[PDB]
Amino acid sequence: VKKLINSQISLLIGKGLHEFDSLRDPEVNDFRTKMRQFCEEAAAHRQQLGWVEWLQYSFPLQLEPNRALLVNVKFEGSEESFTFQVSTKDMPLALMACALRKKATVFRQQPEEYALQVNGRHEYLYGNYPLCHFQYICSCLHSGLTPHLTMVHSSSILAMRDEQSNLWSLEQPFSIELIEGRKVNAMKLVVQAGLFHGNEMLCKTVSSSEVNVEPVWKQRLEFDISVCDLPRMARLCFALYAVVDCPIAWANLMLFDYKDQLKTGERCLYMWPSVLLNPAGTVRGNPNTESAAALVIYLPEVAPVYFPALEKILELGRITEEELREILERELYEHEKDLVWKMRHEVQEHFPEALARLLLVTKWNKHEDVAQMLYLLCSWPELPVLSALELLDFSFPDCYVGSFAIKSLRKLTDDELFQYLLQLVQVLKYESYLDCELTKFLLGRALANRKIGHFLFWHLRSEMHVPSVALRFGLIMEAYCRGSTHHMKVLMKQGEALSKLKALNDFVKVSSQKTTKPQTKEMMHMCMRQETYMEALSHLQSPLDPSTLLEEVCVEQCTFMDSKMKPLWIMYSSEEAGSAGNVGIIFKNGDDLRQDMLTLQMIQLMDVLWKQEGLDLRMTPYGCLPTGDRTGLIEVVLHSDTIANIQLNKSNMAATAAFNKDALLNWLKSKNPGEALDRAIEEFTLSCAGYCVATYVLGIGDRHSDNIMIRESGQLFHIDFGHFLGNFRVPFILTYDFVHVIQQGKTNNSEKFERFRGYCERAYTILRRHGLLFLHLFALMRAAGLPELSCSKDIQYLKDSLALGKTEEEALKHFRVKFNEALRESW
Numbered sequence: 001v002k003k004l005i006n007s008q009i010s011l012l013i014g015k016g017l018h019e020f021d022s023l024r025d026p027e028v029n030d031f032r033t034k035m036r037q038f039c040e041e042a043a044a045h046r047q048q049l050g051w052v053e054w055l056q057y058s059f060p061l062q063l064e065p066n067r068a069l070l071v072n073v074k075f076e077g078s079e080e081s082f083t084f085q086v087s088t089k090d091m092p093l094a095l096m097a098c099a100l101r102k103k104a105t106v107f108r109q110q111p112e113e114y115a116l117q118v119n120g121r122h123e124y125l126y127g128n129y130p131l132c133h134f135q136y137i138c139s140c141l142h143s144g145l146t147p148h149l150t151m152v153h154s155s156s157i158l159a160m161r162d163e164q165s166n167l168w169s170l171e172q173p174f175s176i177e178l179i180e181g182r183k184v185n186a187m188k189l190v191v192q193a194g195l196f197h198g199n200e201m202l203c204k205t206v207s208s209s210e211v212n213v214e215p216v217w218k219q220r221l222e223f224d225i226s227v228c229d230l231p232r233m234a235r236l237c238f239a240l241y242a243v244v245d246c247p248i249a250w251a252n253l254m255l256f257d258y259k260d261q262l263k264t265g266e267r268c269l270y271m272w273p274s275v276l277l278n279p280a281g282t283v284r285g286n287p288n289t290e291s292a293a294a295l296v297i298y299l300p301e302v303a304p305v306y307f308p309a310l311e312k313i314l315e316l317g318r319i320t321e322e323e324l325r326e327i328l329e330r331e332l333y334e335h336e337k338d339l340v341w342k343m344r345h346e347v348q349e350h351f352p353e354a355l356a357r358l359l360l361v362t363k364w365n366k367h368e369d370v371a372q373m374l375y376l377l378c379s380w381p382e383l384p385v386l387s388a389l390e391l392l393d394f395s396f397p398d399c400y401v402g403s404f405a406i407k408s409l410r411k412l413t414d415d416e417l418f419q420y421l422l423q424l425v426q427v428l429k430y431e432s433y434l435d436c437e438l439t440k441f442l443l444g445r446a447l448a449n450r451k452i453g454h455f456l457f458w459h460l461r462s463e464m465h466v467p468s469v470a471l472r473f474g475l476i477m478e479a480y481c482r483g484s485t486h487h488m489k490v491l492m493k494q495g496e497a498l499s500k501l502k503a504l505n506d507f508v509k510v511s512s513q514k515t516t517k518p519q520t521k522e523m524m525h526m527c528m529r530q531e532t533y534m535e536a537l538s539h540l541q542s543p544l545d546p547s548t549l550l551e552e553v554c555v556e557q558c559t560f561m562d563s564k565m566k567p568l569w570i571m572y573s574s575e576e577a578g579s580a581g582n583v584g585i586i587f588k589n590g591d592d593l594r595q596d597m598l599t600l601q602m603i604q605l606m607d608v609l610w611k612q613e614g615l616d617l618r619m620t621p622y623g624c625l626p627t628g629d630r631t632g633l634i635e636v637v638l639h640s641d642t643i644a645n646i647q648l649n650k651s652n653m654a655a656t657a658a659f660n661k662d663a664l665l666n667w668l669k670s671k672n673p674g675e676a677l678d679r680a681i682e683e684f685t686l687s688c689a690g691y692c693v694a695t696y697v698l699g700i701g702d703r704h705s706d707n708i709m710i711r712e713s714g715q716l717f718h719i720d721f722g723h724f725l726g727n728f729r730v731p732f733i734l735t736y737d738f739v740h741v742i743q744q745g746k747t748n749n750s751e752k753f754e755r756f757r758g759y760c761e762r763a764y765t766i767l768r769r770h771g772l773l774f775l776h777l778f779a780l781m782r783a784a785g786l787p788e789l790s791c792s793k794d795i796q797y798l799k800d801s802l803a804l805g806k807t808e809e810e811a812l813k814h815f816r817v818k819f820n821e822a823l824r825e826s827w
């Protein structure tokens with residue numbers, strides 16, 4: 001039933017669908033209808049995809065950014081398997097041919113008709129790529145583990161597809177009548193009003209008269225800008241404050257509606273509380289109409305006037321110094337700005353990637369200048385992905401510019417889209433209207449790729465407790481669900497597990513304050529062994545990675561950390577995956593995990609860029625996902641311990657040492673006996689170099705032995721990222737105990753130590769080359785509202801850390817000084 005689906009979406013998204021109809025908002029109604037049709041169209045296209053196309057949608061390939069290898073292969077409808085010896089250069093089709101020839105000798109009598117599933121995972125090996133190019137095979141080679149694959153026939157893939165079915169005349173200056181206000185404060189009240197195009201003012205800010213603290217103004221506010229000169233994306237901003245400075249509230253609105261009509265007349269603005277004008281703030285009123293301060297205003301009836309159509313704009317827009325023009329196109333003076341504007345046609349024809357610089361010099365408060373800009377923009381060639389990411393920033397608020405950025409971003413591969421999905425979702429917070437190119441783009445890509453769909457859902461769902469986005473995000477999630485009824489049910493199962501984990505964690509938090517850890521753990525186990533818990537916590541796709549299946553919860557191995565937020569440690573097992581089904585998740589409630597996730601995704605991007613230059617620093621890109629209000633999951637890295645635990649140098653252990661400095665190296669030796677130690681020290685050195693560079697570039701502070709971990713392989717990694725971008729200028733950090741392992745336990749080992757400095761330098765030089773990408777991504781991230789990523793000073797931190805202004809030689813000299821200063825600071 002359609003009524004059951006509506007109740008299922010309401011429970012899933014955390015907002016009743018009946019709440020959308022109650023708003024009596026035509027913009028909400030049109031978004032709902034239009035996006036339902038768009039998403040149902042994508043669903044219709046999906047149900048008819050060929051079986052290889054269904055594989056690409058549901059299990060997109062996980063590829064890396066000669067030698068012999070053993071692979072265990074079984075068929076779907078059999079327990080029997082065969083261990084084959086293939087090459088790392090061999091294609092999956094060669095492996096499938098071997099599997100079918102071996103099955104032919106057993107059963108006594110087409111590789112193209114199969115795909116190779118990774119046992120116990122929603123992950124497949126298919127296509128013309130050597131086995132070593134697959135992330136699963138690559139991971140198996142580094143750990144020494146044998147790949148375990150399953151031959152799945154095309155009929156079985158199709159069975160999965162089927163089961164998962166669904167104007168220029170108005171020259172008068174702009175003016176408003178400020179009628180009256182509302183709510184309490186301590187003084188007189190002043191309403192400051194500003195007209196903006198993004199962060200930049202269209203005219204000077206004008207204030208109304210001071211009135212003592214239900215205020216009544218009934219005052220005319222006039223602005224130094226003509227009505228015909230108002231850009232399409234013009235934003236009228238307000239700030240209500242008190243004076244003898246005491247900020248009270250703020251409110252913004254678009255001067256044109258979603259249907260391009262210039263707004264008239266009376267508007268009641270339900271204001272948002274403050275920390276004075278906030279141009280980047282939402283243009284939708286505070287939904288808490290009971291307690292919110294309100295500001296009533298009147299927009300004069302200029303008569304029904306709409307913003308001129310594109311055909312009209314283009315018609316109006318249609319109507320040796322080259323040396324200095326080139327040098328400035330690599331903050332600028334007023335004469336330089338006029339040079340760019342005068343030679344705008346030459347920018348289009350010979351310097352198209354300088355469009356951003358041209359957009360920042362155009363006079364957005366003059367409609368003739370805008371029409372001239374838009375005429376060039378509509379015939380402007382498509383720009384690279386890097387250029388388009390810059391154009392998504394609030395510094396480029398025009399709708400045609402926004403539509404241009406999206407058009408250039410259609411060439412993003414699913415892998416690049418996934419890499420930047422977090423920032424693209426944050427850009428939605430800068431959006432002026434509900435129906436927009438970015439939402440249509442995100443919804444389209446999400447419905448064409450199940451992994452993208454999963455993370456788009458969770459990035460939106462985890463922000464539903466935030467009033468300023470709840471409406472927009474709820475509507476996008478409802479639209480998505482219309483596009484995939486099956487994935488909606490898959491996501492509901494995840495939500496049911498998270499609901500139980502929250503309830504379980506609340507119980508643990510209460511119990512842990514009354515009794516011992518063994519007693520709370522046994523009580524946690526008793527709660528989990530209840531049928532409702534056993535059922536809800538088992539057989540789901542991990543919110544951290546939909547390719548990871550969490551089969552049977554292993555209650556005996558579940559525990560909690562008897563500190564701070566009392567996070568839970570949840571273990572799983574799967575007979576179908578064998579040792580690969582043994583995975584864990586950490587559930588944590590009480591901390592905002594958004595910065596933790598951003599820090600880990602930024603380190604993961606560093607790893608990708610390094611690998612693209614053939615540099616593998618053996619990083620540990622474990623998952624971290626916010627799922628709700630101060631709630632999230634962390635992927636467990638098994639076979640790892642904290643540096644602090646190892647450094648405790650406990651007795652009757654294989655790691656016990658004569659000197660504390662040897663505990664870490666002895667731990668490594670105990671986990672890597674004989675010939676394996678060399679490989680382990682190498683893994684430690686590489687990862688130590690990656691994390692030294694990463695923590696330095698990102699300004700990660702408060703680093704101690706309790707928030708640094710080591711894998712049994714030797715790979716070092718970081719946990720509990722509470723602080724970044726120097727928010728307590730953090731120096732480069734070298735630790736003597738780590739230098740000691742690098743130096744193979746020798747006091748003097750310049751050969752090993754300088755190989756390590758070489759790793760650090762190469763890692764650093766690579767990131768500098770992609771410096772602009774980090775700046776563009778962090779600029780989009782400002783939209784998230786993270787307190788450590790609020791201003792220009794936070795972005796300036798990356799510029800200084802990557803030394804972007806300097807030359808490669810100057811930067812490397814400067815980095816070498818910071819490394820030497822850290823080496824001297826290390827005892």
Ligand SMILES: Cc1csc2cc([C@H](C)Nc3ncnc(N)c3C#N)c(-c3cccc(CN(C)C)c3)c(=O)n12
Nearest residue numbers: 560561567568569586622635636637640641642645719
């Ligand atoms: C019970 C529990 C609930 S949350 C939690 C976290 C951790 C560690 C700190 N973090 C991580 N571990 C693995 N993968 C990760 N991605 C993280 C993270 N982030 C441990 C833990 C693990 C091993 C060794 C010790 C040291 N102990 C013996 C003194 C602690 C732990 O036991 N728990």
